[PDB]
């Protein structure tokens, strides 16, 4: 049973107080003590906090827990920009008789200037029509923050079918990066007269519209 | 130095089995206790099993019960984890962990993990080594900001993961963009790679894109060439 349910987000500017809590039952922290994990995403995680409130030496004086009953708390006490790294409580379950992991909190740190898209959109390749096939790729680059939307149309009608859209990534351009991969017939293609990627990005839209008969 | 360091198993069939090792170093092994914890791509750590020091008892996650087994050669100095019955929710990152503690976690008391080591990646899918295909992206004449022009290559429908897409026998570098590929639908994959250059380069220069998908042994080079529509890149300089 995992309930460790922790906040999946939190911001905060450099230098601040930022809390992280986390509220499990009287079984896994009502009974054993919290641990908190570091965790670069995908990437081997590291002991941040023991014994509720512990630090393992080597961890910056500025990182405090606390327990509290059936529930326990991770305070960041001077908010650097390192510290966007993923956040896991956990606690040893004497119910379950298992290690109850959380559900993670990722520290975003809120400086950094609005990137915008930089959407760039390929047509079906002729070989590609050739094999029986249409393919619409839909690229979109140095954005930031990581939070796009990507919106298929076509003449002037939004379009979901075969649109298989990648989730924003993380390009060491320290922005954000996605693809979109809307799938047709080589028949439905040239049914229309134009479609677009329109991709919205903190308000603002961007298309780019692209045309089966280019020559023509 | 702690040293722990997973050996095991990548893409397997749902069904199939795998046997990840972990072999430590920097400590007395026989005196902490062992975790195997994983983590499915994009969501959190998962807790899967823990064995005492002595291997005198062990716990597994509901989940994984039954199928899994925590195994260790206090001997040898390695922690096992025997994964029968492979389904395809089984996917992730499987870490090797210590419990710092006095080599157990119980009522009283639970360390935790202090150490952890790496990960090993192992895939469970329903789904079988496909070559890519791939259909070069060519160059438009629209007229794009001034930002010039971009073109590229369609690696689609490809398995496993990775695919190596150097541009023109890698002499091309840092116009260059290769995309993180998108798990599709099919259970297979697609990238792509997108050379942005200057739309006056484009038609003196000869933009090749060398693909290579190892695992199915795939070498495909594409010529990347525009439009005949272009007649201000296809024509002769006049």
Known sequence: ?216 | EVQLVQSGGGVVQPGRSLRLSCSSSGFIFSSYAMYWVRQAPGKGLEWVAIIWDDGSDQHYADSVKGRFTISRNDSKNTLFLQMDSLRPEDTGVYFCARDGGHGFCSSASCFGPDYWGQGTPVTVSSASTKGPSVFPLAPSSKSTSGGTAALGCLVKDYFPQPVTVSWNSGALTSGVHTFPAVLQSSGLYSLSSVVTVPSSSLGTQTYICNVNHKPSNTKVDKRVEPKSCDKTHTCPPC
């Open chain 1, 1 to 216: 049973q995992s309930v460790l349910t922790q906040p999946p987000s939190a911001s905060g500017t450099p230098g601040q107080r930022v809390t992280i809590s986390c509220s499990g039952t009287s079984s896994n922290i009502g009974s054993s003590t919290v641990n908190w994990y570091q965790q670069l995403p995908g990437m081997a995680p590291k002991l941040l906090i023991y014994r509720d409130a512990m630090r393992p030496s080597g961890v910056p004086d500025r990182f405090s827990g606390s327990k509290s009953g059936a529930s326990a708390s991770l305070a960041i006490g001077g908010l650097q920009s390192e510290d966007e790294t993923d956040y896991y409580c956990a606690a040893w379950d004497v119910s379950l008789n298992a290690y109850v992991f959380g559900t993670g909190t990722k520290v975003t740190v809120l400086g950094q200037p609005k990137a915008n898209p930089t959407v760039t959109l390929f047509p079906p390749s002729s070989e590609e029509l050739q094999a029986n096939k249409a393919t619409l790729v839909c690229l979109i680059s140095d954005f930031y923050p990581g939070a796009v939307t990507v919106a298929w149309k076509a003449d002037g009608s939004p379009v979901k079918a075969g649109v298989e859209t990648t989730k924003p990534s993380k390009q060491s351009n320290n922005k954000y990066a996605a693809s979109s991969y809307l799938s047709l017939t080589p028949e439905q293609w040239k049914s229309h007269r134009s479609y677009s990627c329109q991709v919205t990005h903190e308000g603002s839209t961007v298309e780019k519209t692209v045309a089966p008969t280019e020559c023509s």
